[PDB]
Symmetry: D2
Subunit: 222 residues, 4 copies
């Protein structure tokens, strides 16, 4: 698809969570074919963040998903124009989020740009988010399905955000993946298992952390 085994990517997130506007920029290396990525994020505006940085995580690339040969890779096939995605975040405490990502490709640079807009609200002031009581997301299995006569995908995943107290914090992810160009081939409903971790790196001069994700496409084990 014009993809390298190893890739670099850029991040620019524009957001407002519970009235708090902020600005995050990033950089990363990834293995499209490995379904792995490691990114570095920085709050260049609105920091330090008043909420849990874990809610932004997934709003930062399905391209970085190791697909089987028997399965159509909507995302990679997306090369070279890229694609866009929108996602609803339904937290168990009533908080609501919408995220919009625009994936574009710096072909010769072999760099994938990500431009996102994140909007979240109704995050309880006592919640783990407002109280920054989170730690990491739990491993998951997302259902990916094609939209008949549409050329788009639908991602369905029930997320669990692990808290310091040891508890879980539930969130429903509902995504729509839209390729920038009409897709010749469409995949069949499948699954995407993921592993996303955050490791802070804030100094005291800057709020930063590093993200990391691993994902493999799979079919129903039946």
């Amino acid at each position: 698809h014009g993809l390298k085994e190893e890739m670099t990517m850029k991040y620019h997130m524009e957001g407002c969570v519970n009235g708090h506007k902020f600005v995050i920029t990033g950089e990363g290396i990834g293995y499209p074919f490995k379904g792995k990525q490691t990114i570095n994020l920085c709050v260049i505006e609105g920091g330090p963040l008043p909420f849990s940085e874990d809610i932004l995580s997934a709003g930062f690339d399905r391209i970085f998903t190791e697909y089987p040969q028997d399965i159509v890779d909507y995302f990679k096939n997306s090369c070279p124009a890229g694609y866009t995605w929108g996602r609803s975040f339904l937290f168990e405490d009533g908080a609501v989020c919408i995220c919009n990502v625009d994936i574009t490709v710096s072909v010769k640079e072999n760099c994938i740009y990500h431009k996102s807009i994140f909007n979240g609200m109704n995050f309880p002031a006592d919640g783990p988010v407002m109280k920054k009581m989170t730690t990491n997301w739990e491993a998951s299995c997302e259902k990916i399905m094609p939209v008949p006569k549409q050329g788009i995908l639908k991602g369905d995943v029930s997320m669990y955000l692990l808290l310091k107290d040891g508890g879980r914090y539930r969130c429903q992810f509902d995504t729509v993946y839209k390729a920038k160009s009409v897709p010749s081939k469409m995949p069949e409903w499948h699954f995407i298992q993921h592993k996303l971790l955050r490791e802070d790196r804030s100094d005291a001069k800057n709020q930063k952390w590093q993200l990391t994700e691993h994902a493999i496409a799979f079919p129903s084990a039946l």
Copy 2:
């Protein structure tokens, strides 16, 4: 409240619904104390909108609410600084919207400026919105409750967008009302009844519509 019986208001809305970007601007005259208002909207970008306009309606002011003396008017009391609002639209069919509005009032201009940011997704292609089969919102009764120790308000209302077939289409509105400065006083939980309508007014050069809203504050009967 430094407000006038009759006034004016200006609107500027930016949004991307189901990936469709659009810009809307409006003008209006209102009666803060009557809780009445009529507004004229004109899509000045992304028109014509590929979805129903009905979804954007409420996304265009709690200042325009007839409040009883017995009840604290957090909104009017919001002067001079003004206030802001955040809202989540939970449509029965899976669609998700978020709207944030920044409210500011010009004394010298006797106008109320509204700057909204409407975002929505997961609007089923064959849905009433995507297939523009909506007519009007059914009259509501919203619940306004104070957030102890937060200085903010919470609005809760179950909306119904009336369809052409005469079928209702459900949507849960969850609002957060926050004044720009620390509130001197807080009201008690109460209700707000509203009636909002839409009259199309598009031509061929531009897509336009008129909005109207009447709201009255109330207590438990």
Copy 3:
């Protein structure tokens, strides 16, 4: 409708909340035309209840609703066969409830019988319900609407359960009202404001409390 100004009623609730089976019986007096009712409840089985008794409250009669003349009283018109209702309870903490009520009339006795089945689950062990941290429901306004070509009603109300800490506890009430006989006249969408209070009366020999409700039908004040 054969209704008296003053009425007596009987209660028999069969339930299981979070695995806890219980049995409540009751008796009450009401004013159909006043839209008022006062009932006395007793846990004859499964007591003392492990959960907050406030969740059962509304599962105990729209007949007791003061209607305007301009508005059709589906419920009273229901005389003399009575009617049935089913309701879903969606609590903010994930707990789920379904309630089914069967309203029958002891015509000459002028007594209204109520036979209910209550099923609730996913009530967090730390919740106000499990922790019995509730006190009373807050006043509400329910939307009542007709079902085109069905002869049934739909009740929509967002409930708030007041806690001891002073906080609210949200619950979505979604009802279906089915008259025992084909209705000649149907009402137009309207509203029903309610006030429901609980006043314990458990001795130490028996778990009991008294309920009380006031309700008036209204049209959109527009």
Copy 4:
């Protein structure tokens, strides 16, 4: 676990969906260790059901789950006492169901008895269920997580009931798995993948259908 590679099971179901009461009884053969099972159902009351049978399917055993040695099988470990389950069905169109099952095993009979209580409402009259336009459930992947200090399990899965038009119909399954006696050990969060199908087998004297399910436990890949 006192269980047998191959076994039998008996079913008795009582329910009132949308006010329609019904009684169902079934017989089956299963492979606890294979996580496989086939069951034969017969409406012996309230038939024919006015709604889709597909809704009752999952309402008919986590014992039948192929579990890796590396993972704790809370269900099989549930022997001898057995276990119970509670589940909420959150259908996209507003329908609401609750199902509770009491699980008991006869050593001497090598059969597993299932006593369910299915309740459901708000099934849109023109819905796929009410208009019986459903075919089968799409293969799933459920999330099984332990409840610390409770001795219970929590199952989470987003279901899709396939329609005749080939359209999917959404339903959220939220389960609570509770053993009859204090568990010696607890498993770690893991997944359960399932494949469940329905083959009609009604005649004219009785309404019958066959159910089949294959489930395998798994960890994060």
